[model samples]
Target chain A: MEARTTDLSDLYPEGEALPMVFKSFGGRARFAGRVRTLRVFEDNALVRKVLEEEGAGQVLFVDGGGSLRTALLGGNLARRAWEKGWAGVVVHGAVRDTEELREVPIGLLALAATPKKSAKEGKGEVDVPLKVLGVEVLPGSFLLADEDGLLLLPEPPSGVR
Target chain B: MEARTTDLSDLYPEGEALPMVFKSFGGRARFAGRVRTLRVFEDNALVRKVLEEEGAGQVLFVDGGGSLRTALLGGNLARRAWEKGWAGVVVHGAVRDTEELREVPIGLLALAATPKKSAKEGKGEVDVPLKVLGVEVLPGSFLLADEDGLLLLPEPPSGVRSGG
Candidate 1:
């Protein structure tokens, strides 16, 4: 859990403040990757579509409008992400199947847990810029998340500035 | 861990409905005991006061006004609960020190986590009825909490309700 202790403030000294509002409910609390933003509301059809593809060392950041009413992801999809070699999943909404979620290998982060699952509507914008938690997150941005919090580097780690 | 499968609904078929709004974050997700209600906001002096006393197989339910601004309990208080043999802690507000809380062998259900510690003003009442998450929680009431949710019985488990 070295990622949990790695201070983002010192690493990204010139970047904006990291948002630490999310709690670590998943088995793997620390994960870092290039971001792939998806904006949806209580619908995870597109989320499945992306996780089914090659992960390519990217983190799926789903902007679900912070809805606690329904869960956008669960054990089945989390397992798919794990098998597909996805690094992590950060949801701005709720998720269910806490028992199953804990057993999955992939990193899963959400606002809360709910019993209700998301609708099957396939309506969302993929690879878009998202402004969540008072911070702007764009596609291809580097996101390093751990128990401490989430840090956004405007450029991917492989690139400077 | 056994409490995870022990459903409160099946245990107490005629008991009052339980308000299962909070989420479990600590190591021991399941815990059952008599309730000890405390109503406080942004202050943990009374909380420390009660936890220091012998828990007697009771769960400390703190109604912290559902405030996420400051944490009423942390690793320090949770450690005290474990050392004192408390069954569990259900907070209506927030708690910090997640990593340390995971090490304590007690049921912890809370709204969220915060970095700021609470004031030590010694405010709030103890052993009184508290309404939280749209459920009426009374002192001395039996509370059976698990991964499924929380169950409320007005009487303690040592009474006629429990088969064990």
Candidate 2:
């Protein structure tokens, strides 16, 4: 738990972490790293556009307004994250394709899972400060977690692997 | 991450894993070996039966169908899983009692967490190739996954952990 707190702090510190409630799902996916955030109001078409880029150990945080009405992330986008080498994904909304999403290595933490998919209306913001999972994720703040626990550090822990 | 993947694959090749889904709400669990799986439907009755075994090191896979509409698993069974030495249990649906589950060293995966319970109709399948996590888990097929990415090998790679 200390590690999770430390890693978590590294990402948000005492000021940035906003109070949002995100639940843990999927297998054992622990992460704490520099946050690369996206703030979207109602659409996620940009999610696909962003994930296509090869992720260099960055965790994409999507603020989906805590709506289970539609899934912001799905198996296809998660697969895109896998091929892009992302650490994991944290969605403030919902996800789908559980079995397929689990097959990919990327860690997934979502509010819930829905057979329903997100509207491709191309309506959302990116790289903006967003509240989710009981914390405010600011761009470039480090977030870390593992099987032990989830933590936030003020910065990368000076380790490369 | 690479090590996690390597350990999983090295532990269970594609030969020993049974492809199935298990769905139960909130049960303490621990899993062993790598390839064995049990399919759990949206019922918790079979969970009681498995808990009776008490630490068998057998892995149970639950197929909750990613439905948060009802919680098929929770904490009592998780304690039973720990007591029974069940290697692990995977859920394709939702689970509750997360605070309690954090203490148990069970390999748990689910679609989400819900505040509701499920109906017990005695529905479950023990040995079957359950379509899970978007992969067809076959009986006795090697199943390996972790943060790196899940890979399905047609055969056991080599030096599998056969605690026999």
Candidate 3:
């Protein structure tokens, strides 16, 4: 939560700075990336499979049909996210079990809460361009979210940050 | 996200708490209801029809066919939600441009975000008992959300931080 006193201005020489969310929420975990994305639906089957495989410097983006009807990501999937070393998961829908989620060091975001579970019939995309919070989440891009609002950064900026 | 006081009362209550979604993102419009609802697939025709009139103390529960293919609500409807004074909206579907939503104080809950926008005309339902967000949001029922989490209080219970 605190930046070290390295005084290393050259480390991040770029003046490109994304505006942080004005309001303060808890910094659940310390993670940042522009490649994070949204999958866009509750085909948990594909999500689970992907979460099981690999992720080095990336966060998963699940657009769970926004159907607070059922939870696409629950405690079990959240556990897998942590086990697989996922930076975090952003569910554009609903999630369950705050008590359990608090235990894991994975950063997460969602709209509301629900106890209902999701269908595991395997019915969604893996990595696709997603639009959330009024921002574009394209592949090969970057995102940063702390207690403030989420930020999006792209390479080869024509203008300064 | 921290409760300055250690009294810790919202977690527990003496009686039934009012079910309401905190209007933190949009204008604080009071849309109250009980056994009041409707359903829709991907159509905004009916939604626009209702918000044009039957809002102001009634939250519209939309079942967007559970489709992530496109956005059910966009900036236009969101503007309607704020202008119509609808307390909040719970989408069982995707919505685009969430940051703009932060500009509006209407309480909102959805499944996810999609760049694919919905068709202005599609199959859907309205003014009916619809279930989404894992709770049966009936008409006249109280729904509340804030920094902590969203609460569906079956009955209206008075007080937020009166230390009750």
Candidate 4:
């Protein structure tokens, strides 16, 4: 039950480690949970919709197509996710409200931060398999993240669930 | 007189701002000073040599040729620079001893960090005009850096220095 991603990688060498670097914006630096995948671009209406649901301590992995022009997540959505009992959130694009994001008690990782918010067109897929930074991420997989990096597993380690 | 790079850029539109992003590794988040240029590759002997001299609140801008395979600066050199009264150090390559580096009071910015140490072979040029990230940095130019980014000016503003 080690929290460090590096330790988890050593324990489960079969796990897929993400090669790209991510900037931590949330209060919690280390978090792990079941995967819930999403794919979107320049829109966060579906992102807010998903966070409104009961999380059951699962992590949301949003694929924003690596766009830095607009932020896909912000303070309101992050605060809602924390209140909804989510374990963490990972975005392939940028984020906004960085000063407020540091106070939310959830693990948030993204490529960068921008002041511009995304469109709310309600355009995106939910609970689908996603290719985040060249790695195949499927719904119902496991993710462990820390300062070192992120590690993806097919399921929780034996006896930890 | 503004401390932020963004404000400095707005004030001095002619100043050259570096486009690449650098991670801050030192204690000070904002730092600015006259530029002292150095060009080295994989070897830090000249880096340490220049840092041993008096800083006079000037920044040592080391051009490590953008190598991340080995660290061009580490804890010992950083502590030495701080003791010598340096305002900051900017590296185009990687740095090591990150944990200890955070305790140093000076501003330290670099591309990344690695565990491997660089060679100590004495191969580098001092006080040379450097082409850093496609921008020319002369020895006597000015540099201002903050969380936003880095800005380079040929000289300090009119009242700040006599050269202007």
Candidate 5:
């Protein structure tokens, strides 16, 4: 059986559950992996740069300040992450190409979907600690997400295989 | 054939389609009816008061100021609306009893869901004009909503059976 956020919350009561509501767009609704943080605002250059490399099943968690104006991730970036073997991508901002994103095999979650694209001026940082909606998300942490919500743990929990 | 917001957008190109994205939590995803406005801030006494009356297939549009702290509508109010023959309810704020709300046959759309309930202070107005997300929604206006989005028309458009 796959790991669920609800069970993990009960098992690890100290785990940090994300409070923000998110909508799933990818084919996979359930996914878990190590966390990789990105603090960007309306820029996908850093996002593309990080996802273009080998993923090794790591989850890229981007904090876009919860902006719904422009999308931080789209079909092309999602396809690149999938091809690179990343586990999933969670954005605090908007995303585009929703219909195209639904076809992607990996897990993709965002606040909303818009038709606008983000800037590509190569701004923002990669692999940094992030305060996503006041929840501290650091690289090397573990993340599990399902329909219920997202849960962040300091390390992988036991009793789940 | 049922009317869809996507098709309505194409048909009525100049119609005012709501920009805010909403999640549907009712049994019926597609619904259309006359608009009834409510402007409240965390208090749902007016909400219950408005929904308790005979709906006659009118849609209640509540502007709860988009507060997710407390739910503006729940299972009981939704059940009342359904039983009263209301067409649907749209809220700019949160709602509770999502599982129960999903069972109701009427249409319910909102920004999010929370466990908190609202205050019943009876301090809000009903049947008034509303500026929902900067779009003017007056009583007696027509509203059509589907999975794509919600569209507001001055009156019922042509070619629909419910058009008056």
Candidate 6:
């Protein structure tokens, strides 16, 4: 929660770069965790699957094709992620249950907010190279996000914790 | 500053409606003003033109074609609007000066924030019909915004100050 992405960008310069396209709607504004990749289109079966597991202070990055028609993550998924100890989530698509999601302690960044829910077709991949909002996200990279934006680091931050 | 869109929506029902697409960024969570419309694309010439005038507690509604390529408004303009007595600004495009914008007094609702600035070629129409977040916003339609979202009323809220 204390890691600032802007300061992290100056320290580690070789991890990756992503534009400021996400905003915070959760209770926690800043969250740091290991990067975990998932790719899905309007379906969040894998999202539930990943959050249901033991996150161990990891962040789940979902590439939902930036679709505004449906939400890939919802209140239940975010609650499960928090319970499993996930640091946060960055969704390329949209999300729902805004009121409920806002109360959750996990960090959430997404394209927009909608009321519709995603289908459970289980159509997606896991632990592979993924692109979110044109930015590349690998499986083992580090993710730092706050009210300002998000930043990617090859590894975790050093001195400033 | 204490006005709520949810409360205004209950007060008036014939103005207009909008869903949850606009997001808040400025320090002021609630703002209400007379609707002032502008239509431009990647240009802030008209934005400056309107905010420079005596706002008289009016909210400028900008239709930037929902272009995220560049910012249509920034801190300087927002500061000027606040100084000139404007209530708020709702941009359909992206915005820059995010940190400085958070310090300003006015309410700002935009699609996203980018470092890119827009052109100032003065290629836009003012006091015209406009739409914000898929809802129609006429020049005379009132605007009520808060953490809940925006509402377009036909008239301004009663018992409010109207000093230009």
| Top DockQ prediction, candidate number | 6
List each candidate's DockQ score: 0.08, 0.04, 0.05, 0.06, 0.08, 0.14
lDDT of every model, 2 decimals: 0.77, 0.60, 0.56, 0.82, 0.83, 0.80
Candidate 5 chain A: worst-modelled 10 consecutive residues by lDDT = A1-10
Segments in model 5 whose C-alpha atoms lie over 4 Å from true places:
A1-23, A30-36, A41-58, A64-87, A93-104, A110-161, B1-25, B29-36, B42-56, B67-71, B74-80, B94-103, B111-128, B135-164
TM-score of chain B of 3: 0.67
User: What lDDT is obtained when candidate 2 is compared to the true structure?
Assistant: 0.60
Chain A TM-score for predicted structure 3: 0.74
Clashing pairs in 1: none
Q: Could you estimate the TM-score for every candidate?
A: 0.57, 0.46, 0.45, 0.55, 0.56, 0.58
Query: For model 2, what TM-score does chain A reach?
Result: 0.79
Residues A15-46 of candidate 6: C-alpha lDDT, one tens digit per residue: 45454677676888778889899999988988
Candidate 3 CAPRI level: incorrect
- Give me the runs in candidate 4 sitting further than 4 Å from their true place: A158-161, B1-164
Report the number of clashing residue pairs per model: 0, 82, 59, 0, 0, 0
In the range B1-164, model 1's lDDT, one tens digit per residue, is 34332455666677655555775767888777778999999899999999998876789999999976556787888989878878889999877666778888888888766545677999999999998877788887778787667777867554443211
Among incorrect, acceptable, medium and high, the docking class of model 5 is incorrect
Q: What value does the interface RMSD of model 3 take?
A: 8.1
Question: What's model 6's lDDT at A45?
Answer: 86
Clashing pairs in 4: none
State each model's TM-score restricted to chain B. Answer: 0.88, 0.69, 0.67, 0.92, 0.92, 0.91
Judged by whole-model lDDT over C-alpha atoms, candidate 3 comes out at: 0.56
* Model 4 docking category: incorrect
What docking grade applies to model 2?
A: incorrect
Candidate 1: CAPRI quality band: incorrect
| Model 6: CAPRI class | incorrect
Tens-place lDDT per residue, model 3, A21-97, is 22121125445543645564644677778777666647776777655544556567778877887777777776665
